[PDB]
Amino acid sequence: VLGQPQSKFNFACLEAREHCKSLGIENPVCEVSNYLFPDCRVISGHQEALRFLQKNSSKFHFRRTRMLPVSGAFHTRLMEPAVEPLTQALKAVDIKKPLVSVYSNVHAHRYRHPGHIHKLLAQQLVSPVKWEQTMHAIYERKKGRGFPQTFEVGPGRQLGAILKSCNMQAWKSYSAVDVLQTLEHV
Amino acid sequence: SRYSPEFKDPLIDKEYYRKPVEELTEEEKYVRELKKTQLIKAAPAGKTSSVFEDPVISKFTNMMMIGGNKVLARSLMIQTLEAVKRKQFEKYHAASAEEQATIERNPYTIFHQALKNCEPMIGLVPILKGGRFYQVPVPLPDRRRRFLAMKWMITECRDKKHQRTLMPEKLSHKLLEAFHNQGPVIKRKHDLHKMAEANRALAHYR
RNA sequence: AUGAGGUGGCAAGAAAUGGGCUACAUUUUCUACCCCAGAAAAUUUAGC
RNA sequence: GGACCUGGCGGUGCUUCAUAUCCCUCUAGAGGAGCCUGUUCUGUAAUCGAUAAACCCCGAUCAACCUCACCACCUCUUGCUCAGCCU
Ligand SMILES: [Mg+2]
Fold first, then answer.
1. Which nucleotides of D are covered by protein (CB under 7 A)?
2. How many CB atoms lie within 10 A of CB A10?
3. Known active-site residue A75
4. CB-based contacts of B24, cutoff 8 Å, min separation 6
5. PTM N6-acetyllysine: at which residues (chain B)?
6. C-alpha B193 to ligand 1 mean position (Å)
7. For chain B, where are the alpha helices, taking DSSP H only?
8. Which among B109, B95, B89 is positioned nearest to B175, based on CA atoms?
């Protein structure tokens, strides 16, 4: 959902839940799942709530609405059954101290002590992704000061567009690694 | 101000000075003699004795300017003029023999007439007397309406609904629409003339 | 002892309001240049 | 008691105009987003606290086992200098 300045997100989620309560289901789920860049979020939950939001976008002041091609509502309490499995698999693994500053998604700050990554990697499963906060925490600085180079190591260029929306100046020094073709045959 | 009160504004009109002394009236002779004694300010960058100078287009360019970037504003103005000229030439080449006599190809004439077609003569003045705001009709001065036409044209061309359409192209289209008494600026003039007719009973508050 | 030291503990939550820091683009952005190029995509606070 | 003089009216209303401050007029923000925050309330035995005095190691940034303040236990003393005290 891409909102405008007059868009109220928690409010619209509230009516999206009222609709499903009126229909009648156990504890309807509809909350912001991803904060990507200003006024753009990803809502997650039951398809009825998302359809309500899509059909009442005009009332909710949503400029654009696009259903993601994903299996289900990620980053919500609906994914709770997937927490206990992952935890066990992470229990055996010995996580060391990161050599570089690795930023988290649950609270959008650097991982400090290695013994807390174990539970943060599981809370990330059922917590919203704080991408905008992470971008601020990495690139926030005074006007005029230089920005670091940015490399998107992986498929696609979505993070490039998100960074462009978040910080234009940080985006000026952004580049993407081509994983579909290579200029030179090494 | 860095000019003393004695300093007077200069007169750049070139043909005024070539006026024969015989034509000069006694009052005009007196003022010409008086200006001799007065101190004159340096002519500002801008107006010139050029025969192609147009104060209306200069004011429009200054009103489009952002952050003092006058080069870009003049570039946009000349691009708009060229676009209007080329559109009129294209429409002229494709017109019938009798239809070519009523097709104006002078961009300056089109610009002036389009701005004149958008000038409102009456406006409103917010006035709160009884604790509630009251919009009262008032006759607009000539300068006020000349300014309002320009401001409405520029604001209409600055709307965000026009996505990625460059300013010269939008401005030429709006100018050619207003030349024919069409478009949203003419409608904004009409909706002001109507909303001031709907409150002709409030003129008694003036 | 209103002086000097040892030991441990002290981690806080809610709204309602005020301020501050960041990006916010087509009159834009990147390269060459420093201006004739190529690509991308309502309230209210101040001032004159 | 007759006639007259000066008035004041800390005067009251209207009439005409000077009628500038202040509105209206012009420009740019602020209503959005993410943070940190001042205040207020409530809480604990305790203080939510302050870094010309910590940590940092692109930029910043939280407690730091810091440190001064505070709570609970204690200890030093004629001691630094006829001492000492950010009362
Ligand atoms: Mg505390």
1. 24-28, 31-35, 58-60, 62-63
2. 8
3. yes
4. B32
5. 174, 194
6. 66
7. 14-17, 26-37, 55-64, 70-93, 107-117, 142-157, 167-179, 184-197
8. B109
